[PDB]
Amino acid sequence: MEYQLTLNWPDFLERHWQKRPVVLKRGFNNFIDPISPDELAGLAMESEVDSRLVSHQDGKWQVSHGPFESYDHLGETNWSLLVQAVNHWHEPTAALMRPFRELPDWRIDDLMISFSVPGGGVGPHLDQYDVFIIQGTGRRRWRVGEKLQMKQHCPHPDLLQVDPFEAIIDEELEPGDILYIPPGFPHEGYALENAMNYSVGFRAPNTRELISGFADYVLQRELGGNYYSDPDVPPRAHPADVLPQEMDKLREMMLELINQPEHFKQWFGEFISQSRHELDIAPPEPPYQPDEIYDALKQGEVLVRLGGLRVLRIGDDVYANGEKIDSPHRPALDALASNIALTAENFGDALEDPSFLAMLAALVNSGYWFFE
Amino acid sequence: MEYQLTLNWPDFLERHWQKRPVVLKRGFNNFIDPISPDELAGLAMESEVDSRLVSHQDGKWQVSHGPFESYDHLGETNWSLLVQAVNHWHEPTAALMRPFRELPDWRIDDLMISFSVPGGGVGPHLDQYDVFIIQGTGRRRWRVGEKLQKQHCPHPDLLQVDPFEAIIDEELEPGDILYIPPGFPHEGYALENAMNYSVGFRAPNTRELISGFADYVLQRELGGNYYSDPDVPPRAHPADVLPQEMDKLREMMLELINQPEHFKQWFGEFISQSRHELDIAPPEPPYQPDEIYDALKQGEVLVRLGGLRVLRIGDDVYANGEKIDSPHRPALDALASNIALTAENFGDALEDPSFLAMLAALVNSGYWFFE
Ligand SMILES: [Mn+2]
Ligand SMILES: [Mn+2]
Ligand SMILES: [Mn+2]
Ligand SMILES: [Mn+2]
């Protein structure tokens, strides 16, 4: 399908994003759910999918990790099924992501869907990331509190919650409504009628993850192999001392390495292009030869990107799922990065180059793009 | 005994250290060996001690590792035995380290001893570390090359090398010292039965700094702050990552690194650790603080465990991967400055109970022993 967002973007980015939560009423007009609770359940039965059941009985909370062989015995009440990264396994669901391209592809994460019977829900909780929560069929009561430091507690080892909060937002969401929550704002919501919620999640790294990742990149690629050297080595009163100048030199090594021109860009390119959830990956059973891709495309057949596969451009280099793609043909690479559903027109003269055709062949044979 | 290096130190550090290799003729006058070859073999058989044995049947070599038994077996000619960190074990060998205190404690590693029967040698190897090779008990032929300078390929470190043209070729007598910087290919082998005492040095490369610091960051779970973009910049293509964003991220990292306390503490814990296993046997019954106090004021002498690294950063003291929590700058400064302390070395600090409780804990860790 194709989904149309009624949001006013400049106003939102200016006043709201990464600042304050909002309820965007009728974000989607005449909202038609991309998927059904049944299709979602069947999808949760699959073993490659990350899914979980969260139920609560009076005070007690029970969290069960999927997949599942059974719809019984659950209840008419007080439970919810959560499925991560549906946009990987379902194309119509993947369509929901497109309207959010007004925000950077690299910051966006994936689409997680929850189905809840009345009373069903995940409880009050905090996130470290921005989220858009889209109301599907049914209705839920959503509550968001002010952003204040609060202790996280665990009703279950597998389930994070906070203490109940005074809501700065308390509302019932109709289908098509969207609730934007910046990180740090406690929120809770629960089904009134049988409900479907679509969370477009976002991702941002912290410093720990960055320095760790890059350290592993340096180790793996065997970089930064230059040793500390002191032909000028300074005198000292006490031989057990390590002088401030030496510490400074030592750290200056790390800073210098971090600032080496290609290395950081390349590492981050390989990192950020990787998905936090498992892709659906099925390399073409026989591999493709370059000229049947050439032919297929020229024959009118269309190339489409695997749902959830991240393609990002940093400078003149492109990165698809951890792998750097480097080609002299810019329009083609731009076509690969900024739109799914590619046709020969988007490639231009690139297909004539056997090198580009070879690369493209390797990308398709990898499962990253497939024919329609 | 207690060794006196005859060396012009200003001239060495100025013209030589980390620059050019030299043969220092009669680096030691009347050089008596700290240890006998059979004693060395006595250590070569041990569970904890790191040894190795290298033999060349011409054109081909064989290497075995410790512990050891039955040296016959075989060999008369053409083999060598090598033992790491002998100063961690044999106390008079650690005294051979004292003259090199003219160089920083943090850059010094340890002393390895190699006994080679005639023809015995390790082959033309290469190091990324500085080394002083002290000749004793017999003679060896040493040759040192010109340090070739492999574009963008990692240096293999200790991996073996080419039959170089020698900028240095000679035969060492007892007391002779061959200093080599990192990068200079070198080979040596025994003529008469030969003892070599190689005092080595250690430097971190950038990779080790970044890995260590990263691990430390994970452990204390620091840098928890998340990248945020209230102002997030517009772009032509939704798939693009702008330079200003890359700068945001990079500066997050640089900021974490330039936080002084964390880097300081981590490195203090990192550099105070030893590259080889120490001898650690805490007193079977411990000492009460009063026992320490008393015995210490009886004129007894505490000595730092051989090979144990104690280093000062700012005013902070680190002993074997751990900080020492304490005031009394003179006393801790003494703990780092002198191996073999006395009551006079501490002075006033002994009357503070909180101080000697700590010190007693140091002794009980096995980091200092009486003699
Ligand atoms: Mn309840
Ligand atoms: Mn072109
Ligand atoms: Mn000199
Ligand atoms: Mn060497």
How far is the centre of ligand 1, averaged over its atoms, from the C-alpha of A44 (Å)? 25
Q: Which CATH class is domain B2-203?
A: mainly beta
How far is the centre of ligand 4, averaged over its atoms, from the C-alpha of A320 (Å)? 46
CA distances from A180 to A5, A177, A196, B226, B358 (A): 13, 10, 16, 19, 56
Stated in angstroms to one decimal place, the resolution of this structure is 2.6
Q: How wide is the angle at C-alpha B262 spanned by C-alphas B258 and B268, nearest 5°?
A: 115
CB nearest A233 (choices: B104, B256, B310): B104
Chain B residue closest in CA terms to A337: B239
- Rounded Cα distance, B306 and B94, in Å: 6
**Can you list the pairs that B317-321 forms with residues at least 24 positions away whose Cβ atoms lie under 8 Å?**
B318/B268, B318/B269, B318/B271, B318/B272, B319/B272, B319/B362, B319/B367, B320/B272, B320/B273, B320/B274, B320/B278, B320/B367, B321/B269, B321/B270, B321/B272, B321/B273
- Rounded Cα distance, B365 and B331, in Å: 18
Give the amino acid at B120: G
Which class for A96: exposed (0-12), middle (13-18), buried (19 or more C-beta within 10 A)? buried
Is the distance from CB of A134 to CB of A174 less than 8 angstroms? no
- The CATH number of the structural domain formed by A205-372 is 3.40.366.30
Same fold, A2-204 and A205-372: no
At A356 the three-state DSSP class reads helix
Q: How many residues does chain B have?
A: 371
Q: Which residues have CB under 8 Å from A235's CB, separation 6+?
A: none
Q: Which residues of A touch B336 (CB under 8 A)?
A: 238, 240-241
Q: Which residues of A touch B333 (CB under 8 A)?
A: 238
- Rounded Cα distance, A255 and A264, in Å: 11
List chain B domain ranges.
Answer: 2-203, 204-371
Question: Within B164-279, where are the H helices?
Answer: 206-219, 243-258, 260-271
**A238–B337: do the CB atoms touch at under 8 Å?**
yes
- Rounded Cα distance, A86 and A91, in Å: 9
**B311–A259: do the CB atoms touch at under 8 Å?**
no
Q: Which residues of A touch B213 (CB under 8 A)?
A: 211, 215, 254
How far is the centre of ligand 2, averaged over its atoms, from the C-alpha of A299 (Å)? 19
How far is the centre of ligand 3, averaged over its atoms, from the C-alpha of B181 (Å)? 14
Q: Which residues of A touch B128 (CB under 8 A)?
A: 227
At B295 the three-state DSSP class reads helix
Task: Kindly provide the b/e burial profile for residues B287-306, where b requires at least 16 CB atoms within 10 angstroms of the residue's own CB.
Answer: bebeebbebbeeeeebbbbb
**A205–B222: do the CB atoms touch at under 8 Å?**
no
At A199 the three-state DSSP class reads strand
Dihedral of alpha carbons B2, B4, B9, B15, sign: negative
CA distances from A4 to A8, A29, A276, B238 (A): 12, 8, 26, 17
Q: Which residues of B touch A334 (CB under 8 A)?
A: 237
Closest ligand, as measured to the CA of A353: 2
How far is the centre of ligand 1, averaged over its atoms, from the C-alpha of A113 (Å)? 22
Cα of B339 to nearest chain A Cα, Å: 11
Residue in B189, B197, B32, B71 with CA at minimum distance from that of residue B125: B189
- The CATH number of the structural domain formed by B204-371 is 3.40.366.30
* Alpha carbon A12 to chain centroid, angstroms: 21
Cα of B254 to nearest chain A Cα, Å: 7
- Rounded Cα distance, A204 and A211, in Å: 14
Q: Which CATH class is domain A2-204?
A: mainly beta
Closest ligand, as measured to the CA of A124: 1
Is the distance from CB of B318 to CB of A241 less than 8 angstroms? no
| Torsion on CA atoms A225, A273, A182, A100, rounded to nearest 10 | 160
Structure tokens, A121: 């829900």
CB nearest A233 (choices: B13, B105, B226): B13
DSSP code string of A248-307: HHHHHHHHHHHT-TTHHHHHHHHHHTS-SS-------SSPPPHHHHHHHHHTT--EEEPT
Size of interface A-B (CB pairs under 8 A): 207
Is the distance from CB of A193 to CB of A138 less than 8 angstroms? yes
**B239–A214: do the CB atoms touch at under 8 Å?**
no
Q: How wide is the angle at C-alpha B299 spanned by C-alphas B298 and B304, nearest 5°?
A: 120
- Rounded Cα distance, A245 and A163, in Å: 50
**B217–A208: do the CB atoms touch at under 8 Å?**
yes
- Residue B119: other Cβ atoms inside 10 A: 16
At B234 the three-state DSSP class reads coil
Q: How was this structure determined?
A: X-ray
Residue A301 gets the label, from left (phi > 0), alpha (psi -120 to 50) or beta, of beta
Rg from Cα positions in chain A = 25
* Alpha carbon B323 to chain centroid, angstroms: 19
Q: How many helices (H) and strands (E) are present in chain B, helices listed first? A: 10, 16
- Rounded Cα distance, B329 and A248, in Å: 23
Q: What backbone phi and psi angles, to 5 degrees, belong to B351? A: -80, -15
- Rounded Cα distance, A272 and A258, in Å: 17
